[PDB]
Design a protein around this ligand. Structure first.
Ligand SMILES: CCCCCCCCCCC(CCCCCCCCCC)(CO[C@@H]1O[C@H](CO)[C@@H](O[C@H]2O[C@H](CO)[C@@H](O)[C@H](O)[C@H]2O)[C@H](O)[C@H]1O)CO[C@@H]1O[C@H](CO)[C@@H](O[C@H]2O[C@H](CO)[C@@H](O)[C@H](O)[C@H]2O)[C@H](O)[C@H]1O
Ligand SMILES: CCCCCCCCCCC(CCCCCCCCCC)(CO[C@@H]1O[C@H](CO)[C@@H](O[C@H]2O[C@H](CO)[C@@H](O)[C@H](O)[C@H]2O)[C@H](O)[C@H]1O)CO[C@@H]1O[C@H](CO)[C@@H](O[C@H]2O[C@H](CO)[C@@H](O)[C@H](O)[C@H]2O)[C@H](O)[C@H]1O
Ligand SMILES: CC(C)CCC[C@@H](C)[C@H]1CC[C@H]2[C@@H]3CC=C4C[C@@H](OC(=O)CCC(=O)O)CC[C@]4(C)[C@H]3CC[C@]12C
Ligand SMILES: CC(C)CCC[C@@H](C)[C@H]1CC[C@H]2[C@@H]3CC=C4C[C@@H](OC(=O)CCC(=O)O)CC[C@]4(C)[C@H]3CC[C@]12C
Ligand SMILES: CC(C)CCC[C@@H](C)[C@H]1CC[C@H]2[C@@H]3CC=C4C[C@@H](OC(=O)CCC(=O)O)CC[C@]4(C)[C@H]3CC[C@]12C
Ligand SMILES: CC(C)CCC[C@@H](C)[C@H]1CC[C@H]2[C@@H]3CC=C4C[C@@H](OC(=O)CCC(=O)O)CC[C@]4(C)[C@H]3CC[C@]12C
Ligand SMILES: CC(C)CCC[C@@H](C)[C@H]1CC[C@H]2[C@@H]3CC=C4C[C@@H](OC(=O)CCC(=O)O)CC[C@]4(C)[C@H]3CC[C@]12C
Ligand SMILES: CC(C)CCC[C@@H](C)[C@H]1CC[C@H]2[C@@H]3CC=C4C[C@@H](OC(=O)CCC(=O)O)CC[C@]4(C)[C@H]3CC[C@]12C
Ligand SMILES: CC(C)CCC[C@@H](C)[C@H]1CC[C@H]2[C@@H]3CC=C4C[C@@H](OC(=O)CCC(=O)O)CC[C@]4(C)[C@H]3CC[C@]12C
Ligand SMILES: CC(C)CCC[C@@H](C)[C@H]1CC[C@H]2[C@@H]3CC=C4C[C@@H](OC(=O)CCC(=O)O)CC[C@]4(C)[C@H]3CC[C@]12C
Ligand SMILES: CC(C)CCC[C@@H](C)[C@H]1CC[C@H]2[C@@H]3CC=C4C[C@@H](OC(=O)CCC(=O)O)CC[C@]4(C)[C@H]3CC[C@]12C
Ligand SMILES: CC(C)CCC[C@@H](C)[C@H]1CC[C@H]2[C@@H]3CC=C4C[C@@H](OC(=O)CCC(=O)O)CC[C@]4(C)[C@H]3CC[C@]12C
Ligand SMILES: CC(C)CCC[C@@H](C)[C@H]1CC[C@H]2[C@@H]3CC=C4C[C@@H](OC(=O)CCC(=O)O)CC[C@]4(C)[C@H]3CC[C@]12C
Ligand SMILES: CC(C)CCC[C@@H](C)[C@H]1CC[C@H]2[C@@H]3CC=C4C[C@@H](OC(=O)CCC(=O)O)CC[C@]4(C)[C@H]3CC[C@]12C
Ligand SMILES: CC(C)CCC[C@@H](C)[C@H]1CC[C@H]2[C@@H]3CC=C4C[C@@H](OC(=O)CCC(=O)O)CC[C@]4(C)[C@H]3CC[C@]12C
Ligand SMILES: *[C@@H]1O[C@H](CO)[C@@H](O)[C@H](O)[C@H]1NC(C)=O
Ligand SMILES: *[C@@H]1O[C@H](CO)[C@@H](O)[C@H](O)[C@H]1NC(C)=O
Ligand SMILES: *[C@@H]1O[C@H](CO)[C@@H](O)[C@H](O)[C@H]1NC(C)=O
Ligand code: NA
Ligand code: NA
Length: 926
């Protein structure tokens, strides 16, 4: 029986086989991907934002596994429990003149600013804050179940300036205060602020150095610590009529969390946030990550609107709704098939929210190849108008199929290069987006050639209205002639005549971009900790709370503060290893004990005391004037032993007569006795963080922990924290290199979670961009076979990247997660227009470099323009989004398209016109 004897004949004779086979295996992917995997969860946006394989990361994971597994009959314990049990065997403020408790981070709260720029310390503003709370939080039908309660009659009062003024001036409520009460309260604040600054006022005094008037309910401490900004009542300009209260805070009796969701959505979300007197500038209801999932899915309307505009661009370009809608079916199918491969074939259990942005990327860059194949098909038709379909298909594929691949492969490879990241979310996103891009290419050389054959065979025969069709035809004709005159006549004259203007202008831009990126101001690393990471645009009240207001209120500053010294924690007997799955963020492994460890050896006892006394001589160590008896438990144990009075027979082994390097059996006996003496002799209680030995279920010491304070303070600056880490880790590693066996495998840990993230963002960006640059230059040598065209192309790609990244630096971008991925992807996208032109310069029949540049611009001009335009339009559609990630990706997509199109069309064609090869001058031998 009959069968097609070549691929071009399969497409030409049986296009319905190709579409039927594609449709069936796409339908299988769509079914199995919904039925078999567990569906994605976006309840935590920050989920994979952690380095896994790093030296610091494995130590941090190990220390967390030690802390969870430490406790009564757990894997490790602070106390020798099997020895210990053997010892045991032997409203109206004139009536209810109080608030229900102290305000805290546990309560729902809002930040006010003045609407007219006034000081907030005025009676209209003070009552307007109470009016907003009453009208927007309390009024809600759910509030009465959520509020903390002293009686069934009414909820507790909210912590607000007007209620503190009421209780200080014996008024019944915020609503019944007067200007005399406001000025009286201002005097009390102005005098007693020095007592608060000097640490003499405090939370419980209702303060022996402090006068009674401002002690009256702890009200002056509570106003200054919780309700007012840090510039109000600062020592400078305190003698001023009313000080500038820029911001003030209000606390609701509702506990901060997911119960606030209805109150927010009903009464805060759609509001204009202003009472005309005061504006609500910040909100902290505990719902930021709960709200994130809703907006993350709701904003998928913007990529859907982008699909319709890309359908319009491509319907006018190709002149069919058939080839156009079948191309957009293939674009959306490549996401569905990528998802089946990702969850079912590759077995990835975690789907980051970053993966939803691959719908934006594929809608922008998906049609690029359809514009190329449709052009080449029409050049092929025009060149040989009586060729049979199998010849026309084969010639079209011979001209198009490699350039379509190289532009796709450069962009997929730039995403797969992010699998070299230590950050789990970045690796997962690189795999998902790289796979969709390659699946889309396979459809553009299978599905789209068979669709083009079916159009020509049937639909090309079939295809006010009686004038509207004619009016449509004549305007479509005029648009196409205008497009042809531009790309064949207008644009080549502008490129060639002004070539010396272009060479000077685009070099000046490249030098400017290189100065901004490499000299000043450079791109910065992240400057907020991971819990404060921005998910919404900076306009959103939840983001202004974390970015602006957490640093202006004293209770939010002292939650960590400036005088945190870095701990130096040193651990033995546990292996610093992550045995969990690095691609599953929830898979932390199992705690591993080191079988070679021994503390109780006389050599181990002697060395570890000498290490403690060596470490105290270093410039990184901070001497507290009170001694830490926990820091080096061996010195405290030596001290206890040399105090045992030894006249009692029970003190026979644990005696002051013994010299310090005790025989191992006397160490193992007396350490248990000394630990059990402590919690009876003193009020001191050990916990899973406390330094000391760690016992197993057979009262055997399996680990030891030492801890010391550093002269280094805690900081979010990368270089200061790198200097701390290098100085301490080098000295500890060097000193441990001379430790006896059984102490040789110890390791150092500290508060280094954010420094490990910053370090991983630095390293992974440099590696992924170097891999992306290597692929970009390689594929251009292998596509042009000429070193001079490949060189002018990589110089234009370099100018594109310096102007693109230098522009993002002037826009205030930092090297965060996602921002770091776009830098790698910028290279792989920027390849594409210089490849399309560089192949058309070589293809040119003209002998002279001017004719070859006119040919190149004439033949690739409108396809390059349409690929740039569809990618720009997809990015421009993401600007109404609340999700920060959508708005950042669309910003990048617009910017990189303008810069890469201009450098490929003006700068790279001007290099080819001035000093381009002619007559095989730089041709690589095959
Ligand atoms: C691959 C990823 C798959 C993700 C799967 C999860 C999808 C979750 C969908 C969620 C969602 C978007 C729908 C668009 C999705 C496009 C996907 C494109 C995928 C391409 C591969 C469902 O939108 C639904 O739309 C229905 C339309 O028929 C509508 O039906 C109703 O009318 C029928 C007659 O029309 C009638 O018969 C039926 O009885 C009715 O009920 C529903 O009530 C409505 O809930 C949520 O948005 C809904 O609609 C608005 C949208 O703007 C949204 O507007 C706000 O927010 C926008 C955004 O922040 C912002 O822009 C807007 O300014 C802002 O006002 C609304 O607040 C929200 O309510
Ligand atoms: C596994 C890790 C164990 C961690 C232990 C951590 C707790 C410290 C225990 C050690 C301990 C008692 C001995 C108990 C048994 C020890 C078993 C050891 C087991 C080891 C396996 C040693 O007490 C020290 O004894 C020394 C003699 O031995 C003595 O030395 C002197 O003599 C020599 C010159 O004449 C020469 O030595 C040296 O120059 C001299 O100074 C010191 O003055 C004295 O401070 C502490 O005793 C007391 O503890 C109190 C709180 O309970 C603590 O109260 C304060 O701080 C509280 C807040 O913490 C706070 O609330 C209180 O308001 C506040 O008042 C006292 O200030 C402290 O004194
Ligand atoms: C998920 C669903 C859509 C999967 C099912 C796909 C089917 C609808 C496809 C698969 C193979 C296709 C067939 C493949 C080849 C042909 C031969 C074709 O005719 C010829 O090539 C000319 C024969 C002649 O000499 O007359 C007519 C359509 C037909 C029957 C196709 C009809 C549609 C079929 C059955
Ligand atoms: C954005 C994605 C989800 C689009 C998915 C499209 C599919 C549902 C396919 C299957 C059947 C296709 C239709 C089959 C036949 C025709 C007739 C065809 O008529 C002509 O050929 C008009 C002139 C021309 O377009 O060249 C126009 C497209 C249309 C409606 C096709 C459009 C695309 C359809 C709806
Ligand atoms: C990246 C783009 C191109 C689409 C990728 C494949 C889709 C088939 C996935 C991606 C996100 C998924 C959605 C993300 C979140 C949800 C909520 C989820 O349910 C829960 O989260 C329930 C609450 C909980 O688990 O606690 C299941 C449906 C749905 C819409 C998922 C259905 C399948 C979706 C659309
Ligand atoms: C994971 C998947 C997506 C990888 C897919 C890779 C292929 C699509 C690449 C690899 C090698 C490429 C081929 C290498 C060599 C050629 C010969 C080339 O030149 C000719 O046929 C010579 C005659 C002429 O140019 O007219 C046409 C393109 C083609 C088939 C290339 C098309 C694209 C191919 C098949
Ligand atoms: C999941 C799988 C199916 C992905 C792999 C798809 C391949 C089977 C496709 C991708 C590109 C295609 C090629 C694109 C271009 C050409 C050139 C074309 O012409 C020549 O080879 C002419 C050579 C000469 O003139 O000497 C023949 C078909 C061929 C090899 C195609 C055959 C089928 C290829 C290799
Ligand atoms: C493979 C073909 C299609 C060439 C693709 C271009 C290559 C130059 C690049 C693109 C993506 C790169 C890969 C992206 C990520 C990684 C993970 C990286 O992992 C590790 O070093 C740690 C071990 C691990 O986690 O697997 C090893 C190199 C590798 C495979 C890279 C090797 C070089 C690759 C294949
Ligand atoms: C989203 C809203 C607010 C604005 C959408 C405007 C678009 C519908 C306009 C803007 C630019 C226009 C395009 C400008 C240039 C061209 C190239 C032109 O190319 C050809 O005539 C040559 C085709 C070939 O060589 O075969 C076809 C029309 C097209 C796609 C135009 C179609 C209509 C477009 C996409
Ligand atoms: C800094 C960015 C905008 C660089 C990327 C785009 C520019 C290279 C474009 C944008 C607007 C263009 C200009 C718009 C209009 C004209 C008038 C035009 O006048 C003629 O007489 C043209 C005659 C012809 O060649 O048909 C000469 C080129 C020029 C300056 C264009 C040169 C190329 C420009 C500067
Ligand atoms: C080869 C051509 C094609 C492109 C070359 C561009 C690169 C040299 C640029 C682009 C982005 C730059 C990176 C962007 C941000 C940073 C953070 C920076 O970290 C810091 O300590 C900054 C100060 C801080 O905030 O603490 C280290 C360099 C690095 C990786 C930059 C190094 C230089 C890079 C890789
Ligand atoms: C020609 C095509 C391809 C692009 C058209 C893009 C415009 C329709 C965009 C560009 C900037 C957008 C604006 C940028 C910012 C905002 C603020 C935004 O304010 C919010 O408080 C709600 C959403 C959010 O959280 O950001 C409301 C939409 C709006 C006016 C956007 C409306 C749509 C605009 C005008
Ligand atoms: C979106 C960013 C990434 C840039 C993408 C490339 C654009 C610079 C291209 C896309 C479509 C092009 C347009 C398509 C058609 C025309 C009509 C053309 O009209 C004539 O030359 C008419 C001459 C006559 O009839 O007298 C003038 C240029 C223009 C606007 C083109 C200018 C270059 C455009 C805007
Ligand atoms: C086609 C390319 C190669 C040439 C330039 C095209 C321009 C239309 C674009 C591309 C990048 C844009 C720039 C990207 C970033 C910024 C920073 C932006 O903000 C600031 O400078 C804020 C300064 C501060 O707050 O202190 C002002 C506009 C500017 C210079 C943009 C102006 C218009 C530029 C040069
Ligand atoms: C060794 C490391 C640094 C990797 C180098 C990779 C490429 C940059 C090398 C590999 C082969 C080299 C080519 C081998 C042969 C030639 C032919 C040579 O002469 C001609 O084309 C003109 C001959 C004439 O005079 O007629 C010009 C340099 C070129 C393209 C070489 C330029 C550099 C190439 C592309
Ligand atoms: C209050 O401040 C002064 C000046 O800094 C200081 O000398 C004094 O000791 C402080 N008061 C108390 C009770 O410590
Ligand atoms: C809207 O905002 C203004 C201040 O810009 C405020 O005066 C007004 O009361 C708000 N509400 C309404 C319904 O206008
Ligand atoms: C600590 O430094 C002093 C002063 O140099 C020295 O006498 C002492 O021996 C050092 N102690 C240790 C344990 O290194
Ligand atoms: Na491509
Ligand atoms: Na590319």
């Amino acid at each position: 029986f009959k069968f097609p004897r070549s691929y071009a004949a399969l497409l030409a004779d049986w296009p319905v086989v190709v579409l039927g086979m594609c449709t069936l295996l796409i339908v299988v992917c769509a079914l199995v991907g919904v039925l078999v995997p567990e569906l994605p969860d976006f309840s935590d946006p920050l989920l994979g934002f952690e380095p896994r394989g790093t030296t610091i990361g494995q130590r941090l994971v190990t220390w967390n596994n030690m802390m969870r597994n430490t406790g009564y009959k757990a894997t490790l314990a602070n106390y020798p429990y099997k020895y210990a049990e053997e010892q045991a065997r032997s409203w109206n403020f004139q009536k209810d003149s109080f608030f229900c408790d102290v305000p805290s981070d546990g309560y729902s709260r809002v930040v006010f600013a003045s609407a007219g720029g006034e000081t907030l310390w005025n009676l209209p503003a003070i009552k307007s804050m109470c009016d907003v709370d009453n009208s927007r939080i309390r009024s809600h039908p759910q509030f009465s179940d959520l509020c903390q309660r002293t009686t069934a009659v009414s909820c507790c009062p909210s912590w607000t300036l007007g209620n503190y003024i009421a209780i200080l001036n014996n008024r019944s409520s915020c609503q019944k205060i007067v200007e005399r009460d406001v000025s009286h309260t201002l005097k009390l604040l102005r005098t007693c602020a020095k007592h608060y600054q000097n640490g003499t006022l405090g939370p419980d005094c209702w303060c022996t150095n402090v006068p009674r008037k401002c002690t009256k309910y702890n009200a002056v401490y509570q106003i200054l610590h919780y309700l007012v900004d840090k510039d109000f009542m600062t020592p400078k300009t305190a003698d001023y009529a009313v000080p500038a209260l820029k911001y003030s805070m209000l606390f609701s009796p509702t506990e901060k969390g997911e119960s606030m969701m209805n109150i927010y959505l009903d009464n805060f979300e759609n509001w204009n946030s202003s009472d005309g007197i005061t504006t609500v500038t910040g909100i902290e209801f505990g719902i930021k990550h709960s709200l994130f999932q809703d907006y993350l899915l709701m904003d998928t309307v913007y990529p859907a609107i982008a699909i319709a505009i890309v359908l319009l661009i491509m319907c006018v370009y190709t002149k069919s709704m058939f080839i156009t809608l079948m191309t957009m079916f293939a674009i959306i199918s490549s996401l569905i098939v990528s998802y089946f491969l990702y969850r079912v074939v590759f077995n990835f259990e975690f789907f980051p929210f970053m993966n939803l942005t691959a719908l934006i990327i594929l809608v922008g860059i998906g049609a690029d190849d359809a514009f190329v194949l449709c052009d080449v098909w029409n050049y092929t038709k025009f060149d040989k108008p009586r060729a049979e379909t199998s010849e026309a298909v084969s010639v079209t594929l011979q001209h198009a199929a490699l350039s379509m691949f190289v532009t796709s492969f450069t962009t997929a490879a730039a995403f797969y290069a992010n699998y070299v990241s230590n950050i789990t979310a970045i690796r997962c996103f690189g795999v998902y987006a790289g796979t969709a891009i390659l699946v889309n290419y396979v459809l553009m050389v299978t599905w789209l050639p068979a669709v083009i054959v079916l159009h020509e065979r049937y639909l090309l025969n079939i295809f006010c209205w009686a004038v509207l069709c004619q009016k449509c035809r004549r305007v479509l004709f005029a648009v196409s002639e205008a497009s042809r005159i531009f790309f064949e006549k207008v644009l080549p004259c502008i490129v060639i005549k002004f070539r010396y203007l272009w060479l000077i202008w685009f070099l000046a831009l490249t030098v400017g971009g290189a100065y901004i990126v490499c000299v000043n101001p450079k791109m910065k690393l992240p400057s907020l900790e991971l819990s404060e990471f921005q998910v919404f645009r900076s306009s959103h009240p939840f983001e202004r709370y974390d970015a602006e207001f957490k640093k202006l209120f004293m209770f939010e500053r002292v939650h960590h503060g400036e005088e945190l010294h870095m701990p130096i924690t040193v651990i033995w007997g546990v292996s610093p290893e992550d045995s969990g799955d690095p691609l599953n963020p929830k898979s932390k492994g199992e705690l591993t004990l080191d079988s070679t460890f021994n503390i109780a050896s006389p050599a181990s006892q002697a060395w570890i005391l000498h290490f403690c006394q060596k470490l105290r001589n270093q410039t990184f160590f901070h001497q507290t004037e009170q001694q830490d008896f926990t820091s080096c438990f061996i010195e405290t144990f030596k001290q206890w032993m040399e105090n045992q009075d030894c006249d009692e027979p029970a003190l026979y082994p644990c005696c002051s007569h013994c010299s310090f390097p005790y025989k191992q059996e006397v160490f193992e006996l007396c350490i248990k006795k000394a630990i059990m003496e402590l919690d009876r002799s003193t009020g001191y209680h050990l916990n899973n963080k406390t330094p000391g030995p760690r016992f197993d279920i057979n009262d055997t010491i399996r680990a030891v922990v030492l801890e010391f304070q550093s002269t280094f303070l805690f900081t979010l600056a990368y270089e200061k924290m790198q200097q701390f880490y290098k100085e301490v880790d080098s000295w500890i590693s060097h000193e441990l290199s001379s430790a006896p066996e059984g102490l040789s495998r110890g390791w150092f840990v500290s508060n280094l979670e954010f420094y490990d993230l910053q370090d991983s963002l630095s390293d992974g960006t440099l590696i992924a961009m170097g891999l992306s640059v290597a692929v970009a230059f390689s594929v251009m040598l292998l596509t042009t076979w000429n070193i001079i065209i490949s060189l002018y192309a990589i110089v234009s790609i370099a100018g594109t990247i310096f102007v693109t990244v230098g522009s993002l630096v002037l826009l205030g971008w930092e090297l965060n997660v996602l921002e770091s991925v776009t830098i790698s992807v910028a290279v792989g996208l920027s390849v594409d227009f210089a490849v399309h032109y560089g192949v058309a310069y070589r293809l040119a029949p003209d002998p002279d470099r001017e004719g070859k540049v006119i040919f190149s611009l004439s033949r690739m001009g409108s396809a390059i323009a349409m690929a740039a335009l569809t990618t720009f339009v997809a990015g421009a559609m993401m600007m109404p989004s609340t999700v920060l990630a959508y708005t950042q990706l669309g910003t990048f997509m617009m910017l990189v398209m303008c810069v890469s199109w201009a450098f490929a069309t003006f700068f790279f064609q001007c290099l080819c016109r001035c000093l381009g090869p002619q007559g095989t001058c730089g041709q690589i031998p095959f």
